[PDB]
Amino acid sequence: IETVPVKLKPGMDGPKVKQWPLTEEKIKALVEICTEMEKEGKISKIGPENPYNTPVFAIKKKDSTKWRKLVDFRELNKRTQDFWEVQLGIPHPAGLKKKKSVTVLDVGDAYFSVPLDEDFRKYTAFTIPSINNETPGIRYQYNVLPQGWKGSPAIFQSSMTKILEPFKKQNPDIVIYQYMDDLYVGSDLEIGQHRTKIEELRQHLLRWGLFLWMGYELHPDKWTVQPIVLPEKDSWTVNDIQKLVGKLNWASQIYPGIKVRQLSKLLRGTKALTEVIPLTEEAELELAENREILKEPVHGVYYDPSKDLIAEIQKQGQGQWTYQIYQEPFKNLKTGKYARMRGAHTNDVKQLTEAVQKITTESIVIWGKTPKFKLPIQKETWETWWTEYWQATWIPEWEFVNTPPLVKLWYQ
Amino acid sequence: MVPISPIETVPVKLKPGMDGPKVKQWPLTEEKIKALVEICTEMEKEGKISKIGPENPYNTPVFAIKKKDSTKWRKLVDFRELNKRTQDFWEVQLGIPHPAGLKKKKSVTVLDVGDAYFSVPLDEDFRKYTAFTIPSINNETPGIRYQYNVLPQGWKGSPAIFQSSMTKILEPFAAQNPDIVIYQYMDDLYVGSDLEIGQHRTKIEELRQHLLRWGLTTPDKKHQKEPPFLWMGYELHPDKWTVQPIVLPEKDSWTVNDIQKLVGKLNWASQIYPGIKVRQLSKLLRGTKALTEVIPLTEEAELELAENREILKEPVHGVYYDPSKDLIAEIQKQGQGQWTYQIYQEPFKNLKTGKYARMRGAHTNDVKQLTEAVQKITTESIVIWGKTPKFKLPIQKETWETWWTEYWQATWIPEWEFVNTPPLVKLWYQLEKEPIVGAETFYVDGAANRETKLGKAGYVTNKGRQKVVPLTNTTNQKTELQAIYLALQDSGLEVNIVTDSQYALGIIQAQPDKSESELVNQIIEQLIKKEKVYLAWVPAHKGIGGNEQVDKLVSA
Numbered sequence: 005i006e007t008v009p010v011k012l013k014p015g016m017d018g019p020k021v022k023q024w025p026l027t028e029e030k031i032k033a034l035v036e037i038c039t040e041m042e043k044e045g046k047i048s049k050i051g052p053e054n055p056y057n058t059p060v061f062a063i064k065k066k067d068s069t070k071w072r073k074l075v076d077f078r079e080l081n082k083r084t085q086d087f088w089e090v091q092l093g094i095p096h097p098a099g100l101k102k103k104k105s106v107t108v109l110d111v112g113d114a115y116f117s118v119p120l121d122e123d124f125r126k127y128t129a130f131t132i133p134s135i136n137n138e139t140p141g142i143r144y145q146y147n148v149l150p151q152g153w154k155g156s157p158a159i160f161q162s163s164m165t166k167i168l169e170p171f172k173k174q175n176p177d178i179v180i181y182q183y184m185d186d187l188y189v190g191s192d193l194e195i196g197q198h199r200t201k202i203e204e205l206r207q208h209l210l211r212w213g214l215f216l217w218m219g220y221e222l223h224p225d226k227w228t229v230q231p232i233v234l235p236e237k238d239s240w241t242v243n244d245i246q247k248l249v250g251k252l253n254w255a256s257q258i259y260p261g262i263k264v265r266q267l268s269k270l271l272r273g274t275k276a277l278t279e280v281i282p283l284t285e286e287a288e289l290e291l292a293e294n295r296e297i298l299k300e301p302v303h304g305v306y307y308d309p310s311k312d313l314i315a316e317i318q319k320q321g322q323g324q325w326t327y328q329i330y331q332e333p334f335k336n337l338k339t340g341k342y343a344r345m346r347g348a349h350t351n352d353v354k355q356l357t358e359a360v361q362k363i364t365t366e367s368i369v370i371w372g373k374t375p376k377f378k379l380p381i382q383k384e385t386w387e388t389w390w391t392e393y394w395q396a397t398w399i400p401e402w403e404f405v406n407t408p409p410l411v412k413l414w415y416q
Numbered sequence: 417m418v419p420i421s422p423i424e425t426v427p428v429k430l431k432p433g434m435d436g437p438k439v440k441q442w443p444l445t446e447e448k449i450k451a452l453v454e455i456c457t458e459m460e461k462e463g464k465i466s467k468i469g470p471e472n473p474y475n476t477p478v479f480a481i482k483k484k485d486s487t488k489w490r491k492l493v494d495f496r497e498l499n500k501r502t503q504d505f506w507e508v509q510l511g512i513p514h515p516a517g518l519k520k521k522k523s524v525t526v527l528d529v530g531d532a533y534f535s536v537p538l539d540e541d542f543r544k545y546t547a548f549t550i551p552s553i554n555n556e557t558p559g560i561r562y563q564y565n566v567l568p569q570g571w572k573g574s575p576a577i578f579q580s581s582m583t584k585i586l587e588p589f590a591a592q593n594p595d596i597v598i599y600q601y602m603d604d605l606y607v608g609s610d611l612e613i614g615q616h617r618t619k620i621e622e623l624r625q626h627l628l629r630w631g632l633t634t635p636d637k638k639h640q641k642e643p644p645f646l647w648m649g650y651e652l653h654p655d656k657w658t659v660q661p662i663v664l665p666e667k668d669s670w671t672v673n674d675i676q677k678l679v680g681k682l683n684w685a686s687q688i689y690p691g692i693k694v695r696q697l698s699k700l701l702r703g704t705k706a707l708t709e710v711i712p713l714t715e716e717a718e719l720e721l722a723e724n725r726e727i728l729k730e731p732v733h734g735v736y737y738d739p740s741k742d743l744i745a746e747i748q749k750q751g752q753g754q755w756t757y758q759i760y761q762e763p764f765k766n767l768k769t770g771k772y773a774r775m776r777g778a779h780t781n782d783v784k785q786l787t788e789a790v791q792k793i794t795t796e797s798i799v800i801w802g803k804t805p806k807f808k809l810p811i812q813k814e815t816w817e818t819w820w821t822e823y824w825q826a827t828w829i830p831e832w833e834f835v836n837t838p839p840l841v842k843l844w845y846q847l848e849k850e851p852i853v854g855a856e857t858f859y860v861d862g863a864a865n866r867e868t869k870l871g872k873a874g875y876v877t878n879k880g881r882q883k884v885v886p887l888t889n890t891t892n893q894k895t896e897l898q899a900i901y902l903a904l905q906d907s908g909l910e911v912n913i914v915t916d917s918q919y920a921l922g923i924i925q926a927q928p929d930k931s932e933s934e935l936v937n938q939i940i941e942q943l944i945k946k947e948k949v950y951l952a953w954v955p956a957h958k959g960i961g962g963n964e965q966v967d968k969l970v971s972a
């Protein structure tokens with residue numbers, strides 16, 4: 005009751021974004037979901053005088069028989085005012101990434117209890133398309149705080165604090181962080197005990213008058229990184245040395261004191277790629293000095309909250325993917341590698357979509373925001389398939405890389 | 417009086433900051449004025465317009481148009497100015513159904529809703545913006561002022577508001593009668609079904625009763641319109657569909673405009689007639705675009721045209737969609753970046769056909785083009801049928817497996833089977849993952865003077881083989897490729913090549929089988945003849961042996 009006034013940014017109109025094609029099964033799922041939402045008063049049919057649109061689709065969560073509606077609010081979110089209103093801002097908890105277990109709950113259903121400002125509702129318009137456009141698309145707008153809209157956790161925040169008050173007081177060591185529709189709850193407790201506290205938290209919400217039963221278990225304290233490492237060999241071919249010199253040359257952009265001079269002089273003359281070259285003393289020392297340099301962290305690396313996070317991903321083959329998260333080039337805030345399976349042994353695009361989601365999760369936990377992705381895929385391939393594999397309730401930004409990176413070699 | 421339900425009005429606004437139109441009424445002949453007065457008098461009696469007071473500041477110009485042969489005038493109110501100032505609406509008439517997605521129907525009846533077409537109420541607050549003036553005879557009295565009570569023809573919001581109003585009326589009828597389909601186009605309603613013809617006729621009467629609730633009358637004497645329907649450039653029949661007749665003109669001379677209309681016809685035909693090709697005819701439109709300019713047809717264009725004429729020799733039809741059957745999509749490579757496809761359920765009966773053309777780029781290959789074609793057909797099929805067809809592709813399973821596992825990008829194609837229908841898509845070369853033992857190692861380099869465009873390209877090898885070629889009209893990037901070409905040309909069937917060129921690596925790692933660059937093409941031709949090629953990259957100027965040597969030789 006008593007909606008918070010919401011506006012777009014100055015000079016901006018509402019989103020007009022084309023609905024992309026949906027499969028029969030997704031349309032059917034959305035028709036059933038929206039019919040109920042309309043009955044519960046969450047959404048209402050709208051007329052032709054509302055020009056706006058935001059795309060909608062549906063996803064099936066890990067271990068669930070039921071579809072979840074997912075609205076892609078990315079455009080609306082860009083066009084919506086930032087919220088300083090009661091709150092100056094939420095300083096992102098730095099201890100969340102230090103917990104031994106972090107469970108992710110979908111709390112988005114709680115948002116539906118708060119009415120959305122009457123004048124802002126039209127900007128939430130969405131369309132359920134029909135197969136072959138044989139009947140007019142079904143047009144709705146939200147009467148309450150929608151899931152996936154950045155304004156929702158902002159507006160619901162006063163209620164959430166109230167709800168979580170007895171749990172926080174009873175449990176001072178628990179780190180609870182909210183991002184969009186997700187609630188991230190960390191603890192250092194034994195997992196069986198951790199799981200109990202999670203269900204304890206669930207009931208708090210449930211009794212408040214309610215996909216909540218689910219949880220997504222993370223262990224960020226065990227999250228690793230990929231420092232630059234060099235081969236240790238008893239015999240080096242000309243090819244091995246060329247690869248080493250190439251890798252070190254690349255590293256010298258990241259690290260100040262890397263020297264290739266002595267190693268490069270092992271290559272003196274014009275030799276068969278497979279010929280074994282013994283290392284000279286000067287070369288061996290130089291290699292050792294480079295090894296030591298590479299065991300130190302990179303100089304002048306700092307996170308700036310005013311700048312976008314950028315995430316790059318390389319396909320390494322055999323279900324392996326490497327990635328780097330950075331603000332400025334060569335200053336990596338995080339690097340990593342996924343040998344992760346989750347099916348998709350015959351599908352590259354499913355693997356990539358899973359990687360994008362896992363990286364975004366890591367980014368949310370560490371910095372409290374999503375990165376902009378540079379994806380090693382053709383746009384048309386990505387756009388055709390990504391929504392088939394998408395399990396997250398948010399969506400990040402992305403762009404496409406059409407030129408093969410030479411640096412794939414050295415993250416391998 | 418039988419009470420009727422009012423049609424709810426849609427609230428309408430002008431764009432923010434904008435006022436309504438104020439536009440001078442043109443002078444009109446006394447003849448035209450009298451005709452407009454009579455026309456408006458009738459319209460006013462029917463409640464469509466109303467006379468207004470002097471206080472309304474707005475105006476839109478009114479015209480009198482004479483129907484050809486006629487003694488009878490028609491009223492035209494030109495809403496162009498009001499339309500500029502009217503808010504945007506949701507427009508549902510985009511996204512026309514494709515005939516191939518329609519279902520076979522036993523009966524399709526047409527009802528005339530034109531009574532409703534001009535009868536939908538206009539939002540009361542917006543009516544003032546529709547004001548117009550009939551000029552007085554001789555200009556000796558104030559003009560007669562009217563405004564619209566109903567959606568005006570030619571106004572920006574009329575099609576969307578009429579469609580949405582009709583849809584809302586029809587919704588409960590459609591929902592409670594799942595055994596029929598209803599489609600609204602202009603002033604007609606089309607109702608199909610599979611019902612026994614008596615039952616179908618009953619549903620039609622029931623629909624007529626339902627419409628009466630809003631006071632909308634459908635004429636007792638029924639429609640002249642019957643299957644086949646000419647609609648949106650197609651011909652719809654109860655059990656089949658096609659495109660309206662495609663006839664390619666005979667000419668001894670062709671212009672920009674004629675070749676444009678030719679390709680447009682061919683594009684339209686390609687959704688049913690299999691194998692249509694536009695490549696060579698499209699190439700004639702490159703650059704230029706002086707419309708009346710006559711372009712000589714190349715031999716290639718003539719060949720393509722002749723091939724199309726044969727395809728278009730006799731009528732071809734598609735069938736409709738049967739939801740109980742799988743969709744199959746089959747693709748063939750036509751050459752020159754052209755691909756063609758058929759989508760069917762039963763063998764030898766196509767729902768639709770289509771084509772795909774290679775995207776413009778410096779370098780490409782057949783596998784990438786096939787992949788792109790697949791994604792295009794997939795997207796089209798989701799739109800039309802709401803599902804992905806099973807694919808039949810002219811590429812072997814082993815070929816695809818080798819491609820996607822080794823390709824630097826993520827790539828995928830959905831469920832598919834190999835069909836052996838030449839030409840087959842294949843991998844023309846694959847580079848080695850590891851240096852080749854026993855194969856000669858070529859260290860290559862090139863350099864060019866940025867001013868004179870003079871350069872050198874060459875190599876040195878572990879066997880002491882060496883070459884340096886002086887070059888003219890070249891660039892550093894070109895010499896780097898030239899050097900690689902020389903190494904391929906001069907080596908045996910297995911070779912290791914070492915380059916410092918990131919540019920050359922970027923191109924080769926993209927695995928092109930064809931290029932706009934003649935140099936890249938000859939490089940590809942060389943690669944195809946090798947048994948084994950290992951390409952290694954090293955950084956320039958690092959003191960790397962054999963790279964240093966050749967860099968010095970080529971730097972002049």
Ligand SMILES: Cc1cc(/C=C/C#N)cc(C)c1Nc1ccnc(Nc2ccc(C#N)cc2)n1
Pocket residue numbers: 138513517518519520521524597598599601606607608643644645646647652653654655
């Ligand atoms: C899009 C559409 C255009 C017209 C007509 C437009 C006009 N003019 C008529 C109808 C009834 C429809 N709607 C649908 C929906 C589902 N299946 C069909 N199948 C179908 C339609 C016409 C014929 C015929 N003859 C056969 C099958 N039509």
Ligand SMILES: Cc1c(CO)cnn1-c1ccc(F)cc1
Pocket residue numbers: 024025026387388389390391794795796798799
């Ligand atoms: C264009 C698009 C997006 C936009 O990123 C997401 N899915 N799609 C899509 C969906 C279905 C298709 F068949 C093709 C593409």
Ligand SMILES: Cc1c(CO)cnn1-c1ccc(F)cc1
Pocket residue numbers: 873885897898899901902934935936937938939
């Ligand atoms: C073969 C070719 C082309 C066309 O394929 C362009 N430059 N070159 C070229 C010419 C001379 C060379 F030594 C190496 C390459």
Ligand SMILES: [Mg+2]
Pocket residue numbers: 861862863916956957967
């Ligand atoms: Mg050089």
